[PDB]
């Protein structure tokens with residue numbers, strides 16, 4: 001047989017991971033198979049952080065970064081050297097990798113905004129430049145859909161001023177993520193400076209509606225435009241990832257027109273599958 005053959009065996013297919021909806025391991029396994037083609041492009045080359053709920057969303061969960069030796073040997077992996085040590089992460093780059101994610105009850109896949117880059121001579125994978133910016137728009141107390149959308153459109157307009165395109169993704173939880181592919185990749189530190197400059201410019205433009213800082217007392221009635229996830233040490237829920245919440249909602253790509261809907265809400269995994277069939281990947285232009 002082939003040494004590099006990728007195989008995953010689904011166990012406990014009937015096990016309910018979302019008690020509120022009765023969503024099972026098998027549901028999740030089929031979901032990740034269903035979204036593989038559109039999901040993979042946006043996690044390719046990135047260290048994948050997992051959040052796992054072995055007995056579902058009403059039972060304890062844990063983040064996992066290092067790839068355990070018990071994990072399939074055929075999974076791609078690469079190392080990040082940080083201040084305190086060294087971490088070797090999985091890189092999910094095949095449908096069977098996503099099958100492994102399902103089998104792990106890794107409901108959530110989280111990635112940074114940079115990709116590993118192979119050295120010309122050595123071929124060793126090392127962290128490379130940011131390929132895209134992400135903004136996390138977190139609505140504060142009492143912020144309406146009209147305001148959050150208004151703020152998203154303001155971000156998009158400022159980015160267009162600098163020749164960039166913006167893609168909205170409702171997070172699956174409470175807020176809204178905006179991605180923009182960089183014309184020239186730049187260091188994560190540089191990406192973070194740029195993202196910060198954008199958030200501060202918007203805050204200057206609409207200080208009643210937007211904050212660029214974490215400070216808790218300034219949050220009420222404002223959208224927090226979080227630029228800090230562009231840090232190379234930070235990770236953000238991957239597009240098409242499930243969320244480990246009461247319902248199986250998804251970090252779902254949207255159209256700008258959809259954000260114009262006052263009835264805007266998070267989308268469930270079944271809706272996301274139907275939308276892929278109809279429209280393909282709304283994020284097709286974000287990566288590759």
Ligand SMILES: Nc1nc2c(ncn2[C@H]2C[C@H](O)[C@@H](COP(=O)(O)OP(=O)(O)OP(=O)(O)O)O2)c(=O)[nH]1
Pocket residue numbers: 049063110136138171172173174175176234235236237
């Ligand atoms: N403890 C821990 N926290 C993490 C890690 N990676 C990311 N986080 C935090 C920072 C991210 O903002 C967050 C990802 O999911 P959250 O629900 O907290 O933020 P998200 O923007 O997805 O939801 P929202 O739209 O604000 O309701 O988790 C990690 O490895 N360990």
Ligand SMILES: [Mn+2]
Pocket residue numbers: 136137138175176
């Ligand atoms: Mn948020």
